């Protein structure tokens, strides 16, 4: 029952800031990077989530996230001894997934936009097959490009085409029915030796069971892979938080508004963080922010 | 009299931005790579409005005409009128009475910058009003610094309160308003406020008491940038820079909107790109004409 | 007394420059031209000529007026068309008279510790000229200056593929009265341009060209691209917040130079009450504790 | 030879949640870990024997980043500080490391930058006796410890957050001491909050007429790494300087190389390993001469 979630947070162009700090624990303004893809799983209604990372960093992810009870969710943890490809998430997470459907998001993917929740909730309601995303961009060549028909059925996915068949690119967010476990087990490793998520998606494509949800004009997919990208991403979140006033990926807020934790739960977390900005945000959340 | 017209109010400001507005009209200040006024202009164009009146001070009007010309480059018509005295936002309908004629009209403040996914559908809906007025409510966590709009679940407006200590909603009123033709006579009848201005809030309050004021909400994820402080302008520029670098499309490239609306031709776009060949903006136009693959 | 000239006339920034002069664009909280003007004032110069295009010159007049608000004097002269940087000495001949004169480009924004000391020294020249050398890792995109240990300039090349030094020449120059005649005599370029490089070469080949270095730690911002302007504004915002002092607040420079009175400052702050810039002026008159 | 200590341990929760799983001094400042900045200051002062103090949980991460120091021609030693017992505790934890040497102490979260800063550091590092602290010029000194001094640099008083400041110069976390500092630290009394305060140490030197201050005037920068907005602005500041002047701030390999502590080949080997990264390309350009 209930669709599960996996955040792939292991895995450098960011040297030396990633020499001793996991990329997905780097800050995006005022919160660790991983809070952002975690908020996406939570906004999609997922409460049973698996965190995957390296042997050095997984204990740190536990230090940050704990058992998930503070957010009314359950967090589990599994190590990925080596970065064997994105599809390896379904090998490492086989037991965790069980017979459930599952959403996979990359721990370094940061998205933001108006009317994003309705798209996530729809993707989370898939009955069978798989659902991937298509982010609209002016120059899609640096990415995996997803081509689809006028109804959302995917027809092709090409890696860095010099002649793109569409202007929609594939970010690291995927929703799957329970078939992905075995599909992942049977796919063939690349020549370089790695289980590619594209191979898993090509399989669903081949079966006419791959649909795409679009993140159109006005949606933002930030660049957390370069130093200028991270600075820009932090500046962007700071601006949005200041002008609209609400935090982006405050997991306590999402949990509370989803009814997964109580007002008293929020009050108590705020009390433990009294002299901090984050704590005052939680206190206001509990007080109601006027009309909410 | 046939099509809804538009007015961009781009006149006098206080000295809050002094000294950068001492010699540069606020609405000509840059927001990253384009003059501030391109942003609200893009909103009128996205709403389908092609007959637009630019109102500014006697000193600045010529500079706006230098920038915008007669509008033919964007497939629109620009008219210009001077606001001799800084009389208030509602004065736009007095200064613009002849331009408006018997048409419905949308007014946008020249310093208002909005952005968000699925904003066009909200604009086209507002532009389709049959009667009364349509204003906007921008969602914020702390609405106290603004005008606050209270409304029911169908968008009917109940009240508008300025800087309330006890806000009745978390939605604030920005500088974008759509009106039927009664707005001209309503503006002629409001009383100046205690601060000596013909307030747009007085116009909206008259539509409210007529039972004809509606509001369209701009929810979480939409951006209404701050162009009124130095820090706000800097943040606004950074926000535009990010969206443009990350998604690749420009925000408020008027040529782009005109072209995709069918208002100018591919040849028109190519010719503008040619006059600006060695510039970033020029290259964007060149790419637009080529199709940006499958843009 | 040494005079000063700010060249602010003159596409890459289209469309923000279509109806707004580049040098009036903001750098965080002040018009771009305030930054090079503050350099002339920190060097002690009180008689300044502003040069711009026919279209933009009135806007500079609107901003700066006669200069009395800063205890200086501003004069204005039009440049019908961008005929070259050295043309400032043609257009400015009458303004210059028989005085020594410093020329700064209206789009040049500099910032760094111990900058006033080198401005004052350059402004104290007895004869010849003084230009600057800005330390950079890749000097290829600029005019590259080579000098000896006495600060004597020996060479200047334009965008060399094999630079002879890591110091580049920004738009800031100090000259003795000889520059007018020199600018009158230099030979135009293939594009009918009166290059400032031709002028500097003349002093070079006389052994009368000295250089002041803007070393590691000094910043010369990029005001010529959209990303550069955004970065420049961010930089000024950070420094003003962290050290607390404004960069290129002309009233402050005037008041501390004794060119205007505390009352003058309070008057300006009065007119700008409720504003950030106004409160800064109020504090300046109140003393900022020890100043 | 004068030794150095970087105190990079426990912090408060002000930056929560970005410091929950990442030590504050490993957080990025644009393209390098925060600790590189104060480390660069010790190296520009000519110090090659450096002690890194941190919490038991984070010390291994600092060692992952820094190693034994040989890559920079320096020697890094590591000592634990179970809890932030006070800044002056650095001399108790580091007593054996210090031995009979003079020593410089810098806080791992202090980031300074400015034209002609090296000459100031070299002067402080050359003290014959007593102590040398710093005074950073600000328009409003009230939020800090304020240092009052005379024209030859003698310190008259240091007051914490005075409503009526005796100067516009504030005290940052950078201090140079003769060998008497260990005994002085041993004799100070714990403060009201149960901490061994560095201000107590400086006051002892002050009262003996043996405390001097070096000023960091207008044009010098002391960045704010204590708030989210401060970190964002600090990153933007480094990005600006690096893009506009071309040289990096706190590239330790560069400082080591120019000090003659490592060879051109050492730099080139590190650059080749990082050739696909911007940091690696900077090292290559430095060692291929950067023209001059
Ligand atoms: C390939 C791979 C990636 N990852 C993580 C690192 C990133 O958060 C994300 C995708 O990484 P990757 O595909 O290497 O590229 P990028 O860093 O540009 O996103 O998944 C793992 O945890 N394990 C793996 O085996
Ligand atoms: C509700 C909510 C949204 N968000 C993000 C998700 C989107 O990127 C953006 C907009 O939220 P979204 O839920 O899409 O709201 P709406 O349907 O009204 O537009 O904000 C948070 O980070 N936290 C929250 O608590
Ligand atoms: C009051 C008023 C405003 N305006 C313009 C200036 C701005 O573009 C816009 C709104 O100005 P204003 O109401 O002063 O507020 P704000 O500066 O916070 O936006 O309307 C005029 O052109 N004329 C007027 O008489
Ligand atoms: C189409 C288009 C939109 N925009 C702005 C308007 C909105 O703020 C945002 C999103 O566009 P919008 O038209 O709402 O499109 P969609 O329904 O696909 O999201 O981009 C431009 O600036 N230029 C354009 O050419
Ligand atoms: C060449 C030239 C420059 N200028 C001004 C414009 C700039 O502020 C400065 C330098 O111009 P220029 O070097 O042409 O461009 P940039 O600095 O943008 O790379 O001098 C004039 O006013 N007239 C001229 O004829
Ligand atoms: C004194 C002063 C300096 N500055 C600038 C000039 C330099 O770029 C920087 C540092 O000032 P500077 O006078 O060089 O200080 P110091 O001699 O103490 O090192 O600040 C202003 O903008 N305004 C001022 O009032
Ligand atoms: C007091 C104290 C600080 N520190 C470190 C943490 C910071 O890098 C630095 C200064 O800490 P602190 O004085 O708490 O203030 P701040 O964090 O606002 O700068 O010293 C320790 O490692 N141990 C200690 O006992
Ligand atoms: C030489 C050098 C300086 N710096 C810093 C120290 C100062 O904050 C600033 C300027 O350097 P500094 O050595 O003070 O040089 P100068 O005396 O020529 O001004 O740059 C580095 O980060 N790395 C280096 O390799
Ligand atoms: Cl894929
Ligand atoms: Cl209420
Ligand atoms: Cl209103
Ligand atoms: Cl030259
Ligand atoms: Cl102290």
Rounded Cα distance, C170 and C161, in Å = 19
Instruction: Answer yes or no: are the C-beta atoms of D26 and A21 closer than 8 Å.
Output: yes
Q: Which ligand approaches the C-alpha of residue B87 most closely?
A: 3
Q: Which residue of A has its CA nearest to B290?
A: A138
Rounded Cα distance, A104 and B229, in Å = 42
Phi-psi region of A77 (alpha: psi -120 to 50; beta: other; left: phi over 0): beta
Query: Given an 8 Å threshold on Cβ–Cβ distance, is A233 in contact with B242?
Result: yes
**Local structure of residue D266 (DSSP, 8 states):** H
Query: Given an 8 Å threshold on Cβ–Cβ distance, is A167 in contact with B116?
Result: no
For residue D57 the two structure tokens come to 């949980």
Rounded Cα distance, A73 and B5, in Å = 52
Rounded Cα distance, D272 and C15, in Å = 43
Handedness of CA D157, D160, D166, D170 (dihedral sign): positive
Q: Give burial (CB, 10 Å; 0-12/13-18/19+) of B36.
A: buried
What's phi and psi for B180, nearest 5 deg? -85, -175
Instruction: Answer yes or no: are the C-beta atoms of A53 and A79 closer than 8 Å.
Output: yes
Q: Which atom of ligand 6 is nearest to the CA of C253?
A: 25
Chain D neighbors of A63, CB-CB under 8 A: 20-21
Question: Which chains, if any, share at least 3 CB pairs under 8 A with chain D?
Answer: A, C
Phi-psi region of C155 (alpha: psi -120 to 50; beta: other; left: phi over 0): beta
Rounded Cα distance, B218 and B240, in Å = 18
For residue D283 the two structure tokens come to 């090292």
Within 8 A by CB and 6+ apart from C227, the residues are: B241
List the determination method: X-ray
Question: What angle in degrees, to the nearest 10, is found between the helix axes of A263-272 and A277-287?
Answer: 160
Query: Given an 8 Å threshold on Cβ–Cβ distance, is B236 in contact with A239?
Result: yes
Distance from CA of D142 to the nearest CA of C (A): 10
Within 8 A by CB and 6+ apart from D58, the residues are: D8, D9, D23, D26
Q: Give burial (CB, 10 Å; 0-12/13-18/19+) of B232.
A: middle
For residue B100 the two structure tokens come to 């408006």
The best mutation among B120, B123, B249 to test binding of ligand 4, ranked by most ligand atoms within 8 Å of the C-beta, falls on B120
Tell me the CA distances in angstroms from B87 to A11, B13, B81, B91, C40, one per residue in order.
61, 11, 14, 6, 40
Instruction: Answer yes or no: are the C-beta atoms of B29 and B227 closer than 8 Å.
Output: yes
Counted residue by residue, chain B has a size of 295
Interface of D with C (CB under 8 A): 113-117, 137-141, 165-168, 217-224, 233-234, 236-237, 239-241, 243-247, 285, 290-292
Question: What angle in degrees, to the nearest 10, is found between the helix axes of D264-273 and D278-287?
Answer: 160
Chain B neighbors of C234, CB-CB under 8 A: 234, 238
Rounded Cα distance, C169 and C143, in Å = 5
Chain B neighbors of C228, CB-CB under 8 A: none
Instruction: Answer yes or no: are the C-beta atoms of C77 and C92 closer than 8 Å.
Output: yes
Rounded Cα distance, D10 and D57, in Å = 10
How many whole angstroms from A4 Cα to the centroid of ligand 9? 20
Handedness of CA B205, B208, B212, B215 (dihedral sign): positive
**Local structure of residue C187 (DSSP, 8 states):** P
Nearest CA to ligand 1 atom 4: A11
Collapsing DSSP to helix, strand or coil, B40 comes out as helix
Which option is the CATH number for D1-292: 3.90.550.10, 3.40.190.10, 3.40.640.10, 3.30.70.3280?
Answer: 3.90.550.10
Q: Give burial (CB, 10 Å; 0-12/13-18/19+) of C185.
A: exposed
The CATH fold assigned to B1-295 is Spore Coat Polysaccharide Biosynthesis Protein SpsA; Chain A (3.90.550)
How many whole angstroms from C141 Cα to the centroid of ligand 6? 28
C-beta of A108 in contact with ligand 1 (< 6 A): yes
Q: Give burial (CB, 10 Å; 0-12/13-18/19+) of B116.
A: buried
Within 8 A by CB and 6+ apart from B84, the residues are: B57, B58
Quickly tell me which residue has 């890749």 as its tokens: C138
Rounded Cα distance, A154 and A157, in Å = 8
Tell me the CA distances in angstroms from C282 to C267, C279, C290, D15, one per residue in order.
9, 5, 15, 34
Collapsing DSSP to helix, strand or coil, D3 comes out as strand
C239 alpha carbon, distance to own chain's centre: 20
The best mutation among B43, B89, B177 to test binding of ligand 3, ranked by most ligand atoms within 8 Å of the C-beta, falls on B89
For residue A209 the two structure tokens come to 């069971």
Q: What is the end-to-end Cα distance of chain C in Å, rounded?
A: 29
Q: Which residues pair with B203 in a beta bridge?
A: none
The best mutation among D38, D41, D113, D117 to test binding of ligand 8, ranked by most ligand atoms within 8 Å of the C-beta, falls on D117
C-beta of A252 in contact with ligand 2 (< 6 A): no
Peptide bond into B135 cis (omega under 30): no
Chain D neighbors of C222, CB-CB under 8 A: 243-244
Query: Given an 8 Å threshold on Cβ–Cβ distance, is D168 in contact with C289?
Result: yes
SS (H, E, C) A2-55: CCEEEEECCCCCCCCCCCCCCHHHCEECCEECCHHHHHHHHHCCCCEEEEEECC
Other Cβ atoms closer than 10 A to B223: 23
Collapsing DSSP to helix, strand or coil, C105 comes out as strand
Handedness of CA D79, D85, D88, D92 (dihedral sign): negative
Rounded Cα distance, A96 and A75, in Å = 11
Q: Which residues pair with A77 in a beta bridge?
A: A51
Within 8 A by CB and 6+ apart from C127, the residues are: C176, C178, C208
Q: Which residues pair with A174 in a beta bridge?
A: A104, A132
Nearest CA to ligand 6 atom 2: C253
Distance from CA of C174 to the nearest CA of D (A): 22
Instruction: Answer yes or no: are the C-beta atoms of D237 and C233 closer than 8 Å.
Output: no
Q: Which ligand approaches the C-alpha of residue B150 most closely?
A: 10
CA dihedral B77, B78, B81, B87 (to 10 degrees): 110
User: What does B170-236 look like in DSSP terms, one character per residue?
Assistant: SEE--SEEEE-TTHHHHHHHPPPPTTS---HHHHHHHHHHTT-EEEEEE-TT-EE---SSHHHHHHH
Counted residue by residue, chain C has a size of 291
CATH H superfamily, domain C1-291 = Spore Coat Polysaccharide Biosynthesis Protein SpsA; Chain A (3.90.550.10)
Which of C16, C56, C281 has the highest number of chain B CBs within 10 A, making it the mutation to test binding with B? C16
Q: How many helices (H) and strands (E) does chain B have?
A: 11, 14
Instruction: Answer yes or no: are the C-beta atoms of C168 and C142 closer than 8 Å.
Output: yes
| Pairing of the two strands B30-31 and A168-169 | unpaired
Collapsing DSSP to helix, strand or coil, C220 comes out as strand
**Could you tell me where the beta strands, DSSP code E, fall in C60-180?**
73-78, 101-105, 110-111, 129-135, 143-147, 153-158, 167-168, 172-175
- How crowded is the C-beta side of B50, counted as CA atoms within 13 Å? 16
Within 8 A by CB and 6+ apart from C59, the residues are: B23, B24, C21, C24
Rounded Cα distance, A145 and A140, in Å = 7
Peptide bond into C40 cis (omega under 30): no
| Pairing of the two strands C101-105 and C153-158 | unpaired
What's phi and psi for B226, nearest 5 deg? -95, 105
C-alpha angle C248-C251-C256 in degrees, rounded to nearest 5: 95
For residue A138 the two structure tokens come to 């002016």
Q: Which residues pair with C111 in a beta bridge?
A: C219
Here the contacts of C91-97 (C-beta below 8 Å, separation 24 or greater) are C91/C51, C92/C5, C92/C49, C92/C51, C93/C180, C93/C184, C95/C3, C95/C5, C95/C49, C96/C3, C96/C5, C96/C177, C96/C179, C96/C180, C97/C3
Q: Give burial (CB, 10 Å; 0-12/13-18/19+) of A150.
A: exposed
Rounded Cα distance, A162 and A243, in Å = 39
**Local structure of residue C83 (DSSP, 8 states):** -
Q: Which residue of A has its CA nearest to B164?
A: A290
Instruction: Answer yes or no: are the C-beta atoms of A61 and A51 closer than 8 Å.
Output: yes
Tabulate helix, strand, coil % of chain B (nearest 5). 35, 20, 45
Which of C11, C12, C13, C15 has the highest number of chain B CBs within 10 A, making it the mutation to test binding with B? C15
Collapsing DSSP to helix, strand or coil, D226 comes out as coil
Rounded Cα distance, A289 and B144, in Å = 11
Rounded Cα distance, B230 and B237, in Å = 11
Nearest to B241 by CA among D236, D149, C238, C221: D236
Interface of B with C (CB under 8 A): 15-16, 18-20, 22-24, 28-30, 32-35, 38, 59, 63-64, 66-67, 229-231, 233-234, 237-238, 241, 276, 278-282
Q: Which residues pair with D131 in a beta bridge?
A: D177, D211
Nearest to D114 by CA among D261, D1, D222, D6: D222
Question: What angle in degrees, to the nearest 10, is found between the helix axes of B230-247 and A227-244?
Answer: 130
Size of interface A-D (CB pairs under 8 A): 100
Instruction: Answer yes or no: are the C-beta atoms of A212 and A134 closer than 8 Å.
Output: yes
**Local structure of residue C216 (DSSP, 8 states):** B
Rounded Cα distance, A251 and A65, in Å = 10
Q: What is the end-to-end Cα distance of chain A in Å, rounded?
A: 32
For residue D152 the two structure tokens come to 């030859």
For residue C245 the two structure tokens come to 């002092």
Chain C neighbors of D241, CB-CB under 8 A: 219
For residue D111 the two structure tokens come to 């980031």
Q: Which helix (H) or strand (E) holds D52?
A: strand D49-54
Q: Which ligand approaches the C-alpha of residue A51 most closely?
A: 1
Pocket of ligand 7 (CB under 6 A): D 7-11, 25, 81, 84-87, 89, 107-109, 173, 226
For residue D216 the two structure tokens come to 């960091």
User: What does B120-178 look like in DSSP terms, one character per residue?
Assistant: HHHHHHHHT--SSEEEEEEE-S--TTSEEEEE-TTSBEEEEEES-SS-S-SEE--SEEE
Rounded Cα distance, D99 and D95, in Å = 6
């Amino acid at each position: 029952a209930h669709m599960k979630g996996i955040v792939l947070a292991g895995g450098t162009r960011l040297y030396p800031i990633t020499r001793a700090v996991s990329k997905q624990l780097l800050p995006i303004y005022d919160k660790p990077m991983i809070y952002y893809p975690l908020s996406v799983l939570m906004l999609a209604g997922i409460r049973d989530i698996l965190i995957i990372s390296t042997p050095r960093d997984l204990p740190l992810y536990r230090d940050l996230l704990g058992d998930g009870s503070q957010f009314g969710v359950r967090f589990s943890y599994r190590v990925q001894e080596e970065p064997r490809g994105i599809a390896d998430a379904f090998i490492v997470g086989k037991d965790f997934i069980g017979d459930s459907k599952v959403a996979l998001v990359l721990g370094d993917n940061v998205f933001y936009g108006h009317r994003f929740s309705e798209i996530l909730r729809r993707a989370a309601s898939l009955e069978d097959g798989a659902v991937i995303f298509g982010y609209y961009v002016r120059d899609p060549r640096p990415f995996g490009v997803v081509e689809f028909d006028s109804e959302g059925r995917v027809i092709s996915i090409e890696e860095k085409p010099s002649r793109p068949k569409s202007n929609y690119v594939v970010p690291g967010l995927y929703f799957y029915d329970n078939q992905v476990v075995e599909i992942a087990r049977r796919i063939e490793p690349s020549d370089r030796g790695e289980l590619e998520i594209t191979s898993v998606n090509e399989e669903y494509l081949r079966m006419g069971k791959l649909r795409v949800e679009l993140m159109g004009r006005g949606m933002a997919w930030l660049d957390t892979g370069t130093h200028d990208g991270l600075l820009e991403a932090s500046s962007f979140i700071e601006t949005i938080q200041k002008r609209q006033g609400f935090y982006i990926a405050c997991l306590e807020e999402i949990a509370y508004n989803n009814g997964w934790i109580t007002r008293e739960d929020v009050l108590e977390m705020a009390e433990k963080l009294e002299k901090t900005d984050y704590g005052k945000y939680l206190r206001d959340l509990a007080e109601g922010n006027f009309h909410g």
